[PDB]
Amino acid sequence: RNLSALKRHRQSLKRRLRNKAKKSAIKTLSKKAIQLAQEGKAEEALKIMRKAESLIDKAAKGSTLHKNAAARRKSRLMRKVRQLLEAAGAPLIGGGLSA
Amino acid sequence: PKKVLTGVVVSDKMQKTVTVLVERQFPHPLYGKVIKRSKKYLAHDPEEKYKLGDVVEIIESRPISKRKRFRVLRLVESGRMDLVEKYLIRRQNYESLSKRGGKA
Amino acid sequence: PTINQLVRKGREKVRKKSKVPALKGAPFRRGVCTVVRTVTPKKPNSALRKVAKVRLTSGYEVTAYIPGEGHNLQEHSVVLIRGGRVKDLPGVRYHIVRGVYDAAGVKDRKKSRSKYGTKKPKEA
Amino acid sequence: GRYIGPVCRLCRREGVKLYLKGERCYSPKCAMERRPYPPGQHGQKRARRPSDYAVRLREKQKLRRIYGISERQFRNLFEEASKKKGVTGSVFLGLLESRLDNVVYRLGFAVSRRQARQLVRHGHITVNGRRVDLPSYRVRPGDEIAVAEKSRNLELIRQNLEAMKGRKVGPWLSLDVEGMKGKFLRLPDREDLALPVNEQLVIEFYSR
Amino acid sequence: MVKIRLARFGSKHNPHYRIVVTDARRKRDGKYIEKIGYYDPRKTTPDWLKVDVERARYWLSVGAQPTDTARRLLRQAGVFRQEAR
Amino acid sequence: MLTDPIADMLTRIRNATRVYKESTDVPASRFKEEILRILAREGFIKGYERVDVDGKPYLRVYLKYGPRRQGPDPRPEQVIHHIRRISKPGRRVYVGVKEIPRVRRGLGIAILSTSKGVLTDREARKLGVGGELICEVW
RNA sequence: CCAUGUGGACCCGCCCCUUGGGGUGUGUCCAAAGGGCUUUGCCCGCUUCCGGAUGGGCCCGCGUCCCAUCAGCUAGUUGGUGGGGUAAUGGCCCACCAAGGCGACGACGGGUAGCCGGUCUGAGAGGAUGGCCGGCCACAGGGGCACUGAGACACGGGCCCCACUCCUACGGGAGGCAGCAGUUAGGAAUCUUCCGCAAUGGGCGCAAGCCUGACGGAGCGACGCCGCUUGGAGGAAGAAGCCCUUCGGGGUGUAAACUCCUGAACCCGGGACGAAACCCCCGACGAGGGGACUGACGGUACCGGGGUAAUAGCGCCGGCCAACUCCGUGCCAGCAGCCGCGGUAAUACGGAGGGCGCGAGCGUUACCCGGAUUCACUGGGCGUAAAGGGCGUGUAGGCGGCCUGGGGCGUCCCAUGUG
Ligand SMILES: [Mg+2]
Ligand SMILES: [Mg+2]
Ligand SMILES: [Mg+2]
Ligand SMILES: [Mg+2]
Ligand SMILES: [Mg+2]
Ligand SMILES: [Mg+2]
Ligand SMILES: [Mg+2]
Ligand SMILES: [Mg+2]
Ligand SMILES: [Mg+2]
Ligand SMILES: [Mg+2]
Ligand SMILES: [Mg+2]
Ligand SMILES: [Mg+2]
Ligand SMILES: [Mg+2]
Ligand SMILES: [Mg+2]
Ligand SMILES: [Mg+2]
Ligand SMILES: [Mg+2]
Ligand SMILES: [Mg+2]
Ligand SMILES: [Mg+2]
Ligand SMILES: [Mg+2]
Ligand SMILES: [Mg+2]
Ligand SMILES: [Mg+2]
Ligand SMILES: [Mg+2]
Ligand SMILES: [Mg+2]
Ligand SMILES: [Mg+2]
Ligand SMILES: [Mg+2]
Ligand SMILES: [Mg+2]
Ligand SMILES: [Mg+2]
Ligand SMILES: [Mg+2]
Ligand SMILES: [Mg+2]
Ligand SMILES: [Zn+2]
The number of distinct structural domains making up chain C is: 1
Hey, what domains does chain B have and what are their CATH numbers? 1-104 (2.40.50.140)
Long-range CB pairs of D9-14, under 8 A, 24+ apart, other chains included: D9/D38, D9/D39, D10/D38, D10/D65, D12/D36, D12/D37, D12/D38, D12/D39, D13/D38, D13/D39, D13/D61, D13/D65, D14/D38, D14/D58, D14/D59, D14/D61, D14/D62
Q: Distance (Å, rounded) from C-alpha D117 to C-alpha D132?
A: 11
Are E77 and E53 a contacting pair, CB within 8 Å?
Answer: yes
Between CA F116 and CA F123, with CA F118 as vertex, the angle to 5 degrees is 80
Same domain, yes or no, for F51 and F91?
no
For residue E61, give every residue at least 6 positions away whose Cβ sits within 8 Å of its Cβ, in sequence order, or none: none
Range of the domain at F128: 81-138
Q: Are residues F107 and F46 in the same domain?
A: no
If one counts the domains in chain E, the total is 1
Q: What is the DSSP letter of F100?
A: -
Give yes or no for a contact between B72 and B18, defined as CB atoms under 8 angstroms apart: yes
Pair F92, F35 in one domain:
no
Domain closes at, from F39, F56, F80: F80
Residues facing F31 on adjacent strands: none
Q: Which residues fall within 8 angstroms of residue D15, CB to CB, at 6 or more apart?
A: D36, D38
Clarify whether residues F68 and F53 are in a common domain: yes
Q: Which residues of F touch C7 (CB under 8 A)?
A: none
Residue with CA nearest G76 C1'? B66
Counting Cα atoms < 13 Å in the Cβ hemisphere of F115 gives: 7
Residue nearest to nucleotide G303 (CA to C1'): D131
Q: Is the minimum distance from the CB of D122 to strand G below 7 Å?
A: yes
Number of Cβ atoms within 10 Å of the Cβ of B17: 18
Burial of residue B56 (number of CB atoms within 10 Å: 0-12, 13-18, 19+): buried
D135 touches strand G (CB under 7 A): yes
Beta bridge partners of B59: B4, B71
CATH number at residue F106: 3.30.1490.10
B4's enclosing H/E stretch is strand B4-11
Are C95 and C67 contacting, i.e. CB atoms less than 8 angstroms apart?
Answer: yes
Instruction: Give the residue among D178, D173, D174, D184 at the shortest CA–CA distance from D127.
Output: D184
- Residue F121's Cβ-count burial label (10 Å; 0-12, 13-18, 19+) is buried
Angle separating helix axes A42-57 and A5-38, nearest 10 degrees: 160
Distance from C-alpha of D106 to C-alpha of D67, rounded to nearest angstrom: 12
- Whole-number Å distance between alpha carbons of D74 and D68: 10
How many CB atoms lie under 10 A from the CB of residue E81?
8
Domains with residue ranges and CATH for chain D:
1-96+194-208 (1.10.1050.10), 97-193 (3.10.290.10)
HSE value, Cβ hemisphere, 13 Å, CA-based, for A91: 17
- Distance of E10 CA from G211 C1′ (whole Å): 28
> Which residue from C minimizes the CA distance to B30?
C7
CATH number for the domain spanning E61: value is 3.30.1320.10
The environment of the single-atom ion ligand 30, i.e. residues with CB closer than 5 A, is D 8, 11, 20-21, 25, 30
Burial class (CB in 10 A: 0-12, 13-18, 19+), F96: exposed
The boundaries of the domain holding residue C45 are 1-124
Is residue F7 located within the same domain as residue F21? yes
| Architecture of the domain made up of A1-99 | Up-down Bundle (1.20)
H-helix or E-strand containing A84? helix A67-84
Q: How many domains does chain F have?
A: 2
Question: Distance (Å, rounded) from C-alpha C80 to C-alpha C94?
Answer: 10
Q: Are residues F15 and F41 in the same domain?
A: yes
Using CA atoms of A9, A14, A16, A21 in order, give the dihedral in degrees to the nearest 10: 170
Domain with residue F73: its CATH number is: 3.30.1370.30
> What are φ and ψ of residue E29, in 5° steps?
-90, 70
Q: What subunits touch chain D, counting only 3 or more CB pairs under 8 A?
A: none
Nucleotide in closest CA–C1' contact with E6 = G200
A10 touches strand G (CB under 7 A): no
Domain boundary among F40, F63, F80: F80
Q: Give the residue nearest to nucleotide G104 (CA to C1').
A: B94
Distance of CA B8 to the CA centre of its chain: 6
Closest-approach residue (CA) in chain C for F89: C3
Residues F27, F63 share a domain: yes
Supply the DSSP symbol for D12.
S
* Neighbouring-strand partners of residue F53: F56
Task: Using the CB atoms, write b or e for D103-118: b if 16+ within 10 Å.
Answer: bbbbbbbbbbbbbbbe
Q: Which helix (H) or strand (E) segment is D160 a member of?
A: helix D155-163
Q: Which domain range does residue E12 map to?
A: 1-85
Chain C interface, best mutation among F91, F92, F93, by max C CB count within 10 A:
F91
Q: B47 beta carbon < 7 A from strand G? A: no
Helices (H), chain C: 3-8
CATH code assigned at C105: 2.40.50.140
Pairing, β E65-66 against β E2-8? parallel
Task: Give residue B53's region: left, alpha or beta (phi > 0; psi -120 to 50).
Answer: left
Q: Where are the alpha helices (DSSP H) in B26-103?
A: 81-92
